[PDB]
Design an enzyme around this catalytic site. Structure first.
Site, PDB file in Angstrom:
ATOM      1  N   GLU A   1     -42.269  24.160  17.598  1.00  0.00           N
ATOM      2  CA  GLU A   1     -42.862  25.054  18.632  1.00  0.00           C
ATOM      3  C   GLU A   1     -43.165  24.266  19.910  1.00  0.00           C
ATOM      4  O   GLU A   1     -43.949  23.301  19.832  1.00  0.00           O
ATOM      5  CB  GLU A   1     -44.135  25.715  18.100  1.00  0.00           C
ATOM      6  CG  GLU A   1     -44.749  26.706  19.071  1.00  0.00           C
ATOM      7  CD  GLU A   1     -46.039  27.350  18.596  1.00  0.00           C
ATOM      8  OE1 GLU A   1     -47.089  26.683  18.660  1.00  0.00           O
ATOM      9  OE2 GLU A   1     -45.992  28.518  18.168  1.00  0.00           O
TER      10      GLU A   1
ATOM     11  N   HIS B   1     -46.948  34.754  19.523  1.00  0.00           N
ATOM     12  CA  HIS B   1     -48.357  34.958  19.836  1.00  0.00           C
ATOM     13  C   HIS B   1     -48.598  34.849  21.333  1.00  0.00           C
ATOM     14  O   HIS B   1     -48.254  33.844  21.957  1.00  0.00           O
ATOM     15  CB  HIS B   1     -49.215  33.931  19.092  1.00  0.00           C
ATOM     16  CG  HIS B   1     -48.947  33.863  17.622  1.00  0.00           C
ATOM     17  ND1 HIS B   1     -49.438  32.851  16.826  1.00  0.00           N
ATOM     18  CD2 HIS B   1     -48.247  34.679  16.802  1.00  0.00           C
ATOM     19  CE1 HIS B   1     -49.048  33.045  15.580  1.00  0.00           C
ATOM     20  NE2 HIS B   1     -48.323  34.148  15.538  1.00  0.00           N
TER      21      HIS B   1
ATOM     22  N   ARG C   1     -56.912  34.802   7.701  1.00  0.00           N
ATOM     23  CA  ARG C   1     -55.569  34.405   7.292  1.00  0.00           C
ATOM     24  C   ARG C   1     -54.529  34.837   8.318  1.00  0.00           C
ATOM     25  O   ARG C   1     -53.732  34.016   8.782  1.00  0.00           O
ATOM     26  CB  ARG C   1     -55.238  34.998   5.919  1.00  0.00           C
ATOM     27  CG  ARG C   1     -53.831  34.707   5.394  1.00  0.00           C
ATOM     28  CD  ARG C   1     -53.410  33.259   5.588  1.00  0.00           C
ATOM     29  NE  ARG C   1     -52.279  32.896   4.743  1.00  0.00           N
ATOM     30  CZ  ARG C   1     -51.644  31.732   4.798  1.00  0.00           C
ATOM     31  NH1 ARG C   1     -52.009  30.785   5.645  1.00  0.00           N
ATOM     32  NH2 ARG C   1     -50.617  31.514   3.981  1.00  0.00           N
TER      33      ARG C   1
HETATM   34  N1  LIG Z   1     -49.252  29.488  13.692  1.00  0.00           N
HETATM   35  C1  LIG Z   1     -48.603  29.211  12.573  1.00  0.00           C
HETATM   36  O1  LIG Z   1     -49.083  28.508  11.687  1.00  0.00           O
HETATM   37  C2  LIG Z   1     -47.224  29.807  12.440  1.00  0.00           C
HETATM   38  C3  LIG Z   1     -47.231  31.322  12.587  1.00  0.00           C
HETATM   39  C4  LIG Z   1     -46.104  32.014  11.820  1.00  0.00           C
HETATM   40  N2  LIG Z   1     -44.835  31.253  11.972  1.00  0.00           N
HETATM   41  C5  LIG Z   1     -45.887  33.448  12.316  1.00  0.00           C
HETATM   42  O2  LIG Z   1     -44.751  33.919  12.279  1.00  0.00           O
HETATM   43  O3  LIG Z   1     -46.876  34.067  12.730  1.00  0.00           O
HETATM   44 MG   LIG Z   2     -51.213  31.024  17.749  1.00  0.00          MG
HETATM   45 MG   LIG Z   3     -47.262  28.436  15.784  1.00  0.00          MG
END
Ligand SMILES: NC(=O)CC[C@H](N)C(=O)O
Ligand SMILES: [Mg+2]
Ligand SMILES: [Mg+2]
Ligand SMILES: NC(=O)CC[C@H](N)C(=O)O
Ligand SMILES: NC(=O)CC[C@H](N)C(=O)O
Ligand SMILES: [Mg+2]
Ligand SMILES: [Mg+2]
Ligand SMILES: [Mg+2]
Ligand SMILES: [Mg+2]
Lengths: 441, 10, 441, 441, 10, 10, 10, 10
Positions: free
Chosen positions: A193, A242, A313
């Site tokens: 990421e 996000h 979670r």
């Molecule tokens: N932030 C993480 O630990 C990864 C998020 C996860 N890959 C999702 O699809 O939301």
């Molecule tokens: Mg995030």
């Molecule tokens: Mg992430």
């Protein structure tokens, strides 16, 4: 910033030979019109005509004529052009009469930002989190099922695993003009990421598009394949987008309230309530593909229920611990396959609608894991996100708030595109069915 | 809750 | 018919060494307990015990004890046994206290037939039309994706394509005591149909099970693979199990009415209305698999809407032109993957519920093809069948009429099995998704 | 040492483009957050946020927000970066409120050192002896089962076997700022040991982590595989991480006592007694993996009983002959797979608990080899170390002293991780079972 | 309609 | 529970 | 009508 | 004892 004279000056100085007039269709794909440098003045005079019906995708019915209005602030020169320099400009689509095209996603986001400004909110500060999978390629350069590496969360491997094809990407992005915050290995193997600093909504969406293009190009350079598919593999973590949002009114964060117990103003609570109320309606935009709803399954940190929390979670809305000028609302539904302009527009419109009607924020969910039965869930008033694209499309049609955000022209074409996609998907006979059946029956 | 994280054993 | 002494006489005469005590689970799979001929008297005394929890399938939780009550009329000796003759008996499942097991599909059908007899209907005459596909095998003996031939509807290719492994199946069934009506090539390539003469409901279901087993065995003998998958291939016709039903009261067809314009009694119309209203509830039983709803798509003669017509492209209920003692109601939703006992039970219960409440038959649909819009369809009151297994399961749970036909014990286990199947199916990432995405995103 | 201005000065001078903000999880794995040089000031201002739940490993349940507090004294620039220089900083984990995170192993060691200072002991001087194996790789780059050489204890093979990829490691570590004492070939073939000079506990653990990373990288460069597995092969010596410890109070060794017969002060004897009494409880931390207890078997110099001596086959605690300012207590249980911070913390806490309660040192074991029966062993009061991970975990749970050293948050997550690991291990069917059985039974 | 019927050309 | 029973999907 | 553009599914 | 030491003969 830049001006016409500045653009001409760098074009002559940098020996730019070709210019890409970039725009985006309703599906988020990057489209462009290639231009020789001798037409730069004509392009900068907002006089270039093209089809414009290419926005509709494969459901376009008639050819139109539409003008490209380049945004001078989006000028940049690609580093890999080497011999013949290629530059790009991100353009808005305008009808020949002079009015902006109602079906242009960038115009949609601009219109929603304008009606936000009508309420006194000068800017919408957005920081996204686009994660991608790095797969290996074969002799013909086709994506295989093998990942580039088998690393974990924040894993460190200086050889060619944890970082691998990421340092070069960050370097290229920074050179172009990207303010990169930090980069790390994501939970699932072969996931890296790269995060940027926060910017205004239009700039954030432009940066998302450019980031996807640059990542794909650099990964192809190293003999790898980069995909922003929400769930490329079963049983591993998916990819999310996000989005961290905070409304601003003259460099003042209106989400902040030192007097509040959580440091959240009433405006922020109304924003979150509005986003929660319309979540099932925006699901078709923030999760637009069929594969998007294979990610929204329990056990992989992706949200599956419409709820907010400060520590859980996988809540729909998470509030980071940062306060002051960096107080934010993080929405975790979107996946990188979503159109950034449309997703930001619908999220902002839902938040503004919540602000307008002064919606009441529901109680946050505690460490109570959702192992509770469905009777407990609808007794506590916890809605669930749509289980597939069909439910999301039905909710989109029935919604009168975010359909107005999309507008009348874009809504019909988006619905047609997604209906065709779902119809093509639902009639297929997959290998899983042939494995389960064809011997049992 | 934690299933995709346990992929290291699988 | 047969008696204990008769069975012992043939067993000694035919040199039968092994006996299969056959029964069926909730998923329609044929299960058995192998028995040496020295245990034949013990078996005929209804004293063999077995688990009985094997009826529940892979959701069985605790081992029980249950008795096998063989049906002497179902005795038959397999012809391919050659050296050591093997015979079979179809048995009912009884609890140790003496009462029949409520979870046995054959017992469920018997109970529904008994409550039908309580209304004066002595028998339910059923003629099924199961269709199957023939696939070529590989060296390892596994089915490939290539059909055994490329024939069409009622085609004639005597050499190795038209009949092929269909003449010997009919011959073996005829030697088994079957009453075969006719056989022909089906619409899709490699698809064949063999029709039996009409029999009582329990005998019809037993014949369906035996027919599936025999077809599979004979096809395996000829180096082919026979499947009763509802839709093994995309873009071609699926396989259906049209069920022709007619209620009888002392060798009198109560569906017949010479005075009626269509030659249909009020009892038949009530039966059809009852089947029509409960269609969506029965869909989970007559179309039990995930692949069953890939067949229920327009353009391949499978029904997709709850309506009846003497002549239509795809009606859910068809009324053949035959009259007199052969006036019938044909239901075309079921596929060969369905459990014959459960399917016949739920159809008969829905029809009896229609008869009891004097239900009103809706108007038949004309040659008006369903190209009409959804607004036209719900304006005319034409319901549609469930689009997938999940909708059918929800309707099954919501229904109080055919859930009573299933009973309390069988409903819970069937629902658990189908939820598990759907849950495993919905989280898979299919090759179609990786083809559409993983490059575009 | 270093300061903010110094770090910026070298970063600009050395052309450092990327910075690794390194930290450690509960399992000892090195985790990092990659950072572009443009964020160096932000990192040095202790303003970088990350998940922080990545410390818990694969048992993390919810995402948190934590700050990285880099330690300026840990700055170093990797030598193999060549083109784009990469540097690193080792950071502490802090909660957003400002307090240190209780689950950070480095913070745990710092807290134990602080409560040691509360008794007047200014520093804890630690010298580790980590050993590793070198394996040849295949074409795909995966470790095979063949050792890189076949040398013995202190052997000398100048060409490609004795030093080989050990001289280069020492040279790179020396350039990196390490203080290397000596290197030699270990007892088992393909096993090597490199010793550093003694340093303070936090610096010693940081050096252990950096040493493991550097050894792995350089071995990968030479087409070899370096592992710190406690027992990679059966029938040969395992790898240990003997830790030499001595408490200091204002550059005075409190373990030294010229008047004592063995040159050991009462403080040193209390320290050893405390370590001995809590050995079985610390075993789960110093020997954390399942493979760790395949090393703790008799006949390979690894300790198997809780006892101390100045000269023996394999005592738990050995006292080197050096005296004066270099009088030390050597603990030989730990293997290189252990977390250095946690291992040092638990050993120091056990020693301090021994000091506080004036624990009585048991008699040393003479040249009496442990060929004596178990009755002789428990008659003489010689405890044995746990036979597997399960016993160690049970002893860890029952202990109230070193569980306090771990703290409430880290103990629960470490226990969950190790319980999951043991549960996955215990249900496997190994090839040894299929070799013994599957023919005899 | 007649999609599986027109398979002879496909 | 029913781990070896659900092996048909695995 | 849009068969030429629908080639992405085919 | 000396099991790994005697590995030269093995
Ligand atoms: N932030 C993480 O630990 C990864 C998020 C996860 N890959 C999702 O699809 O939301
Ligand atoms: Mg995030
Ligand atoms: Mg992430
Ligand atoms: N001619 C026909 O009726 C074929 C019917 C089609 N095979 C089905 O599955 O319903
Ligand atoms: N010191 C040695 O001779 C080697 C020690 C041995 N490798 C151990 O694991 O303890
Ligand atoms: Mg037919
Ligand atoms: Mg028919
Ligand atoms: Mg050693
Ligand atoms: Mg030593």
């Amino acid at each position: 910033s830049y001006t016409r004279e500045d653009i001409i000056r760098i074009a002559e100085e940098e020996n730019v030979r070709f210019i890409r007039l970039q725009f985006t269709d309703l599906l988020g794909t990057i489209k462009n019109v290639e231009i020789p440098v001798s037409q730069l003045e004509k392009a900068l005079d907002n006089k270039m005509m093209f089809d414009g019906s290419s926005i509709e995708g494969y459901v376009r019915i008639e050819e139109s004529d539409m003008y490209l209005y380049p945004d001078l602030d989006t000028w940049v020169v690609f580093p890999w052009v080497t011999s013949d320099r290629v530059a790009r400009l991100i353009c808005d689509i305008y009808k020949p009469d002079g009015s902006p095209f109602a079906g242009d996603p960038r115009g949609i986001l601009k219109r929603v930002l304008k009606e936000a400004e009508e309420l006194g909110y000068t800017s919408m500060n957005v920081g996204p989190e686009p994660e991608f999978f790095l797969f290996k390629t074969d002799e013909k350069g086709d994506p295989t099922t093998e990942l580039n590496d088998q690393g974990g969360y924040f894993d460190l491997a200086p050889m060619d695993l944890g970082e691998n094809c990421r340092r070069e990407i960050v370097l290229k992005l920074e050179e172009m003009g990207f303010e990169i915050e930090a980069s790390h290995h994501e939970v699932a193997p072969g996931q890296h990421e790269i995060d940027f600093k926060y910017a205004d909504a239009v700039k954030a969406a432009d940066q998302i598009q450019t980031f996807k293009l640059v990542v794909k190009t650099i990964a192809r350079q190293h003999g790898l394949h980069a995909t922003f598919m929400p769930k490329p593999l079963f049983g591993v973590n998916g990819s999310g987008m996000h989005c961290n949002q905070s409304l601003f009114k003259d460099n003042e964060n209106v989400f902040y309230d030192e007097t509040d117990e959580l440091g959240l103003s009433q405006t922020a609570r109304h924003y979150m309530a509005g986003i929660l109320k319309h979540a099932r309606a925006m699901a078709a935009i923030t999760n637009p593909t069929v594969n998007s709803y294979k990610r929204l399954v329990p056990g992989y940190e992706a949200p599956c229920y419409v709820a907010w929390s400060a520590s859980n979670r996988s809540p729909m809305i998470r509030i980071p611990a940062s306060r002051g000028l960096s107080t934010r609302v993080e929405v975790r539904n979107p996946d990188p396959a979503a159109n950034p302009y449309l997703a930001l527009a619908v999220m902002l419109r839902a938040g503004l609608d919540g602000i307008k009607r002064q919606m009441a924020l529901p109680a946050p969910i505690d460490r109570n894991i959702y192992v509770m039965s469905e009777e407990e869930r609808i007794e506590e008033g916890i809605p669930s996100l749509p289980a597939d694209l069909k439910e999301a499309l039905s909710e989109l049609i029935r919604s009168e708030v975010i359909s107005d955000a999309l507008g009348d022209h874009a809504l019909a074409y988006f619905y047609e595109l997604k209906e065709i996609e779902w119809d093509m998907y639902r009639t297929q006979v997959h290998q899983w069915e042939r494995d389960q059946y064809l011997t049992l029956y | 809750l934690i299933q995709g994280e346990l992929s290291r054993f699988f």
